[PDB]
């Protein structure tokens, strides 16, 4: 079974990525959606990159106020899955900028165990389905590049022990996932992000052992050429053009996959990467390296400067170059910004390298050169996956895809899905939720005056908050809040004519009376430990509860989103 995997960065929601909220992800076209990234410290405690993004932002949902506990990307992912049950949702830990604490965690069994325990709790409270470990990279000594990213940790504590310790970490995670999956009655998966190139693999990836632990592995077959080099090239090519110079030999999807297989990787677990952005160079001279691809593998003149004044051959980026926030000139433009790119760099012509099956843009008069993925190269990558019995495709990243006919950013995502799977719907999966500890009492009220009767009902959220630290306490608080509660009451011969605050309004829907706490501002987010006690009005006085059959409750993340976790709280 193939996979169509997508990264979604938590910073998608701000202006740099055009304020792209999860509801506009084409989730019916994905099998796996990675929340990128969760940080963590050297003691194994999880740490947010952007707390408001993760747990507080309203994300375009009309009834959500900033900071409301049903806000945030993590809750939005749950809604995407409810609305698109083909989808598995998961969490990417680390990434290029937050891999600095892996070496320490992986080296000490007690810290490894704490990290694993915290990740298991996280995915329990967020109802996530997989864990993706993006250790970039084990055994690779690297300092931060604060000009690129003030928050970059690098991997300054890398060591030769990382290769074996990563295997231990992955083994611990998979065993914990197996255990928790059995406890909760669900299937979990474990994935990793892997380097494309041989030297990084040799430094830190025990291929054969790793592939026997993970469910699948995402090969980062992008960023394989760029402004760190003074030779133009393809950054994410399917095949190695035979004219490639030594520095780019090996750095294609095909050669990377073939190397992994030669080292023991199981084909069906290999997911290959597609980049939804350009890289490029300001001023490339055609050296005639490949006469059939002008400008390719040409010499890039060192004519620009980074934000820290370092000379560079890189072209300008879509975003302004600022020290500490995209400070390196890399020719980096989102796929959805190719029209902006062409307005800034005029005179670009589109080329296709038939030997690499990769597009590029080149101005033969100015020398500007950009390398990227398009619909055609993604279709070629998909054909390669199918013909070689590989595992799927991963895209980096969602917010960079282009709109087609709606507000969804889905041009490349749709092309990927249809080339892998065709036009039919993706398989759907059952979604399980853990019932909340919700109890209730019902008490007939003696009313010697007036007409009708009264039933006094109390509903209690018996959950209690135990987790410590910002990450686990916030996801726990959300999970143990009863959200937009609907109460379904089935009676035999008893009519509920009305309801009173703190109850929401009551209606008859089929054989049930339904109380909608989504319509009570004080009742729509019922925190742990809270009780609502309220009067229900009846058409006739009642002396016992014998004609009350059942009371059930359901939740909704938003007033608009699907009901879930329907559970019985009182039965006769
Ligand atoms: O200012 S914004 O909030 O728009 C972007 C903040 N920040 C910039 C750096 N990237 C690094 C991603 S990675 O290097 O870890 O892939 C994460 C987002
Ligand atoms: O002894 S050596 O290590 O030199 C060769 C071992 N060799 C590596 C390649 N795989 C192909 C797996 S697959 O093609 O069936 O997926 C077979 C075994
Ligand atoms: Na960290
Ligand atoms: Na193997």
Numbering used by the authors: 25 to 596
Please share text taken word for word from the publication where this structure appeared.
Here, we show via crystal structures of ChiA and ChiB in the apo and ligand-bound forms that the two enzymes display structural features that explain their substrate preferences providing a structural blueprint for further interrogation of their function and inhibition. We succeeded in obtaining several crystal structures of recombinant ChiA and ChiB in apo (unbound) and ligand-bound forms to resolutions between 1.30 Å and 1.85 Å. Both ChiA and ChiB encode for an N-terminal glycosyl hydrolase family 18 (GH18) Trios-phosphate Isomerase (TIM) barrel followed by a C-terminal putative carbohydrate binding domain (CBD).
When comparing the overall structures of the chitinases, the unexpected location of the ChiB CBD becomes apparent. This CBD-location of ChiB is similar to the one occupied by the Serratia marcescens ChiA CBD. The cleft of ChiB is covered by a loop of the TIM barrel leaving only the sides open to the solvent. As in ChiA, the sizeable substrate binding pocket of Apo ChiB contained a PIPES buffer molecule originating from the crystallization condition. The makeup of the binding pocket is conserved, except for the longer loop closing of the cleft and the entry of the cleft near the ChiB CBD. Neither differences should prohibit the binding of a linear chitin oligosaccharide. The active site motif is trapped in the resting conformation with a low-barrier hydrogen bond between D156 and D158. Indeed, ChiB was predicted to have a typical substrate-binding cleft of subfamily A chitinases, suggested to facilitate the hydrolysis of oligosaccharide dimers from the polysaccharide chains such as chitin, by “sliding” the substrate through the substrate-binding cleft.
